[model samples]
Every structure is written in structure tokens, then in C-alpha cells.
Target: DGEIDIVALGDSLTRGTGDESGKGYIGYMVDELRQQTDEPIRVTNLAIRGLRSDGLLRQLGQSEIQRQIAMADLIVMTIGGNDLFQGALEWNVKELDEAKRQYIANLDRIFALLRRLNSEAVIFAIGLYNAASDLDDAKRTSAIVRDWNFASAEVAAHYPNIVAVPTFDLFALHVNDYLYSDHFHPNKEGYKRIGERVASLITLT
Candidate 1:
């Protein structure tokens, strides 16, 4: 209700890989928060580039990380993208199914752990974007990402305070415009869009 403290976790997207400004959604989100309220908004990004769900789970094990979560008023995360696309950029049903299982399990543990630390903070979990829509199996890849988003949303729903933010639609079409040269992460404008959506959901008055 007073100062806003944000703890960001996840992978490259969380690290703002594609954004030219290097702020990612976290920086833009802070900007929006400043516009929304006069209170000081503090943010700590603990996300690592190329981090997978297993890595995230391990990171959450650290006492320092847990301490941050304990003090956070908002917990924003962008995971599962690395989990789904780490091995192959292309869509593979068998691998995706296996990855989905592990990803969901990890999310469950993460959410439970955060709840144990602070039950009031809103856990904003960012969903995946199919950056490889240019591939021959674009539709299939998008479908898989959609399924993962749905499942991830379901997992977030299990926790009363968590909300899964969607980003796939932002890259569904004109993906090249939103993506960086690597064709994976979000560009400045892409991060801006994500930031706006996330900011809309946050309220402290």
C-alpha cells in the first residue's frame, strides 16, 4: 500500500535481451508505475539470460533470492520460453509434452514457494511468444506455444494471487517488427507493449 517493491525472475526476456534500451518490460513497467502513483517503486531483476525452468527453480533456492521475494510487493516472471525452445526451435510434440510437464511442475513449486514468503504480492507470470513464426512449421509452433500458455495460465490460477500475462498475440503477426535481429526476444516497442499491459493490471490506491 505504500512503496512498491518488484522482484523480477526468469530468462532472457526478463533480462531485456531484445530491447535496444536494455530495460526490457521491467524498466518500462517501472516507468508506468511512476506515472500511476507518486510512491517510490523499487525493482530488482534476478533473471538470467538463457535460464531454464530448472535453473529458475534452483535460483529460487538461494536465500538471497528468497529474501527478495519475501520483501517484494510484486513478483514478475518470464520463464518457460527457454524450457520449451531450448533444445529445438522447431516444434516437436513429444519433447514439448515432456517440457510442459516439467515446466508446470516447476511453476507450481515456484508459486508455492513465493506464497510461503509473501501471500499478498501479486505474481505476474509472463507467457511465451512464438518468436519462430517465420519457420516452416509456424502454425504448429504457435499452437504449441498457445497450449503452453493455456497450461501455464491454469497453473497460475491455482494460486489466488498470481496472474499470467499473455504475449503470444503481440508476436503472432508482424512478428519481425516486434522481434530483435535474433528473431527471439522483444524489441523496444515489443517490450513497451508488454509493459503497458502489465501496468494496467497493477493498482495501489
Candidate 2:
């Protein structure tokens, strides 16, 4: 209801990687909040590009990161993409299953750590979106993304004050429009859509 402090964590998505304007989703989120209220909205980004969930677990140990987490009223996170997508031209189902298992384990710890750091702050864990939905081999990627997001949502559900935000449908049908030239991260429009969606979910206390 008063001042809003948003602390961003994990992966390139939260870092606003592909958006050359550098506002990323978090920037657009801030803009959205500004339009809704005159109250001061402060943002802190602690996300690292190419970060996997295991590395994110290590990031939680830093003193400055811990401090921000404690003070944050809202915590936004995007994780697990790098874990599953790193350096695999051809998808290996068995390998991916193992990766997902490990990712889920670390995710549990990550959520527990965030909760420990800030009991009152709400955590928004953005779901993984598939950029390959419009590709020729869409079927495999689509199912993988769907399952990953579903599993992630289940994990987030176990924790209090944590919401797993789905981005699958947002990028699914018209995926090319939202993807950057790299075809990995989201373009400006993609991030804008995500920002607006997240903004709509935020409720001032």
C-alpha cells in the first residue's frame, strides 16, 4: 500500500537480457506500477545471466543478496531454463528427466531460502516459456515446456506466499513475435506482455 521494493533474482529473463532497451520485464513492471500509484517503487536486480538453479542456490549465500531479500516486499524470480536448455542441440529425454529432477530439488531449497530470508514478502516464480513452439519441431519442445512448468508450479504451491506465474501460453502461439534474434530470450514486446501480466497480479498491502 505504501512503498514497493521489488527484488529480482535468477537467470537472464529477470536480468532483462534480450531487451536491448535494458528495461527487461522488471523495468516494464516498474513502469506499470508507476502508472498505478504515486508511491515510490524501488527495484533491485540480482539476477545473473546463464544462471542455473544450482548456481542460484549458491547466490542466496551472499550477504548483499540476503539483505535485499530480507527488505523486499516482493521477490520476482526466473529460473531453471539454463538448467534444462544448456548446450543440447538434440533433446535427450533421459538426460532432461535427470536435469528436471535436480532442478526441482534445488528449486525447493531456493524457495525455502527465500522464505527464510523474508517471511512477509511475496515470491513470484515466473514459469518457463518455450521459444520453439512455432518451430517445425514444436511438438517435443511444447510438451517439455508444459511439463516443466507444471512441475515448477507444483513445487511453488508447496511454499507459502509463492506464486508460480505461467508464461507458456503467452509465448506459445505467436512465439516468433516475442523472441529475440537469438530466438532464446524474449524481445521487447514479449517482456512487455510478461511485465503487464505480473503487474496485474500484484496487490498492494
Candidate 3:
């Protein structure tokens, strides 16, 4: 019998930036999983603080993350946030869209790898949390995030075992409380909220 229930894969947000204790959101989520199920829940975070989806792809080939993915019962992740927000400057709208499209392609590859690694395991792909602060920027970023999340959902939908959790919509109304002091990452409480969201989704069984 397996010894674990879940595993986490993603970037800084999944790593819980606002968590000074460094237990990470994944850790918190696993803890919550423990409270709900006595199934000996365990989790591993492959998230790197500044990793882009492409960056994770690079790590996937050589790093031990692949091996970890191979052994997990379920996988959870948050990706593509940096790809959309970090590098937007002076580009044509088409180019920007293309870049985002490339990220989606990257996600396709990632999900394909996960499905190949373990066909039976459930993969929960957590969508990007809201980023825009101002009303106008919020609309643009929100739409962009929606597109990316929809792309993620589409990729996940290809697999019967994959599930896309809607973190963006959860943060749509209460942006400040769910965001950190830097207004980018989630605060500890915010990450805890996300962890609760994931825990709720996983407990649906």
C-alpha cells in the first residue's frame, strides 16, 4: 500500500512566499489533508520561487522531480504566473498573446508528462491568483489570468484524472486579504486559504 495521499508541484506561490515559518502552502495543505483523512497524507513541493513553466520543463528532465512525480498518488500545482506578468513590455498585443500561448504549450507538455508518469494519479493544477491592483489593470490581468486558467483547465480536461482548481475566482473579490504586502504573493493567511481550497477539493472523494 502507498504511504501518501498528495504531492505539490509549482513555483513560489505554491511554495508559500508569505510564510515566514517556511512550512509552505503545500505543507499547510497536507496538514489539512491529515485532519480530513487518516490516509497518511504526504506531499512534496517541486516549486522553485522564480520558476516559469519553461524553467520547470528544463528542471523536469534532469532533476529528481520526475522521479517524485512517478511515485505520487496525486499532484497539485500552480504555474504560469510569472510568464504573463513579469515580461510584459513594449510588445505588440499579438506577441503578448503568442507568448502566453507558448506558456500554454508548455503546460500541455507538463501535463502530458504527468499523465505519462502516472496515468492513475489525480493531477490538480491550481490556477494563477489575481495580480492586478488597479481597477483597469485588474480587468486586463484578470482576463489574461482567465485565459491562462482556461488553457490549464483545457489541458487538464484532456486527462480524466486531472483537475483544475479555480484559485483565481476565489481571489477575484478579496484581492487584498489574499495577497501579500508586496501585492504579488499571498500572505500566510492567504496561502492558508488556498491550502484550504485545495484540501476541500481533495476531500471530495
Candidate 4:
């Protein structure tokens, strides 16, 4: 049987925390891919809630993760949110700046390792949203999120096979509608929208 292997790694959003359907964007992307091909699309999602970039670096160090990357045709991930939040409910500018530095370094290493593991896999990294956009510091928070996305986009541009997808605008206007009770991760509709956008970029041929 024709099979396409996809490996998803990152934090809670990648794990489908906000979605009642438990499919997340990966599931929706799989469904979309299925519509385009007769082949079975196998998904191996290793996304851990509250996972940071450092933790992801460690996760990738594992032999099992490397094996999965080696076999993947597509690799998708969502990280850095925990890094920006720094495990806190509030945003601290100094802490976020430092976190971005560390995140950049970790992401560089991650991409390098993945490329070394499998040179042909198309890596799609999802950008962050300001779930805290409705707060008093909405402008500042949104700015930080954009900065984070910009930095990640720069990093993604360095690699030929990697592409960074932005999710900030999706929740920019009607954030509450797309957010869960936590107001952080996306609801089913939000994930569906993201899945459609990402799926459009994928070429099964």
C-alpha cells in the first residue's frame, strides 16, 4: 500500500488540547491529504503539552524520535510558546527575550539534526499566537508574538526544506471564538483553519 509518514512534534497545541475532537491540525491535514491520494497517511505525533524548546531538543536526542524522523515524508511541529510563556501566566519582556535567544539556538540545532537524519523531509513549523492578546498588554503581547514569528521565519528561511506557517492572524480578530476555555490553544474550528492552510502548501505528487 502507498503510505505517507508524517511526524508531529512540539507542545500542547500539537497534541490537540483545545480541540474537543482530539484531531488537532495534524488530523485535519491527514484527512485533507487522504482526499488527494489513495495512499494511507500514517501519523506519529509526539507532541507533549507544555513542552519547551530545550525539552524538544532532548526529545529529538532520543533514538526513537530520530528513527521516526528518518522515516517521515513530512515533519510538522509547534514549539516556543512554552518558552515565551516561561511556564508563567504573565509575560515578562526580559524573560521572553532570553527565551527567544535560547529558542533560536535550539531550533537551529533541531533543524540541522533533522536534516542530517533525513535530507528529504519537508518540515513545516507552526508560528505562535498571542492567546494573551485580550489582556491589558494586548499591544505589547501581540508585538512579542510577531517578533517570535519573525525570528522563527528567519530561521526557517535558512533551511531549504523547512517552512514556517503563521497562526497569529487566525486568532487575531475573533480570538475568543477560536480559543478554548484556556484562551491559549485553538478550538476545533481554529485547528481546521490551520489544517487547511498547511494542507494547501503540501504537494502529494
Candidate 2's error at 4, in angstroms?
2.0
Off by over 4 Å in 1: 88-91
Q: For each candidate in the order shown, give its overall lDDT on alpha carbons.
A: 0.87, 0.89, 0.75, 0.88
Give candidate 4's error at residue 92 in angstroms: 3.8
Task: Give the Cα-based TM-score of candidate 1 against the true structure.
Answer: 0.95
Q: Which stretches of candidate 2 lie over 4 Å from their true place?
A: 88-90
Per residue, candidate 3 scores C-alpha lDDT tens digits across 17-58 of 877567666877778777765666666777888888898777
Q: Write the per-residue lDDT of candidate 1 for residues 1-205, one digit (tens) a residue.
A: 4678899999988899989997899888888788878888888999999898888988999998888889998999998888888754644668767888999999889889889988998899999888889888787888888999999999998889799999888787788999898887789999999998898898777
Measured against the true structure, the TM-scores of the candidates, in listed sequence, are 0.95, 0.95, 0.89, 0.95
Decide which is better by lDDT, 1 or 2.
2
Ranking by TM-score: 4, 2, 1, 3
Write down the lDDT that model 4 would get.
0.88
Return the top candidate by lDDT: 2
Kindly list the per-residue Cα lDDT of model 2 for residues 1-205, writing each as its tens digit.
Answer: 4678899999999999889698999988888788777889999899999899999999999998898889999999999999888883346778888999999999999999999999999999999888977667878888888898889999999999899988888996778899999998999999999998998998664
Regions more than 4 Å wrong, model 3:
88-91
Q: After superposition, how far is residue 155 of candidate 1 from its true place, in Å?
A: 0.6
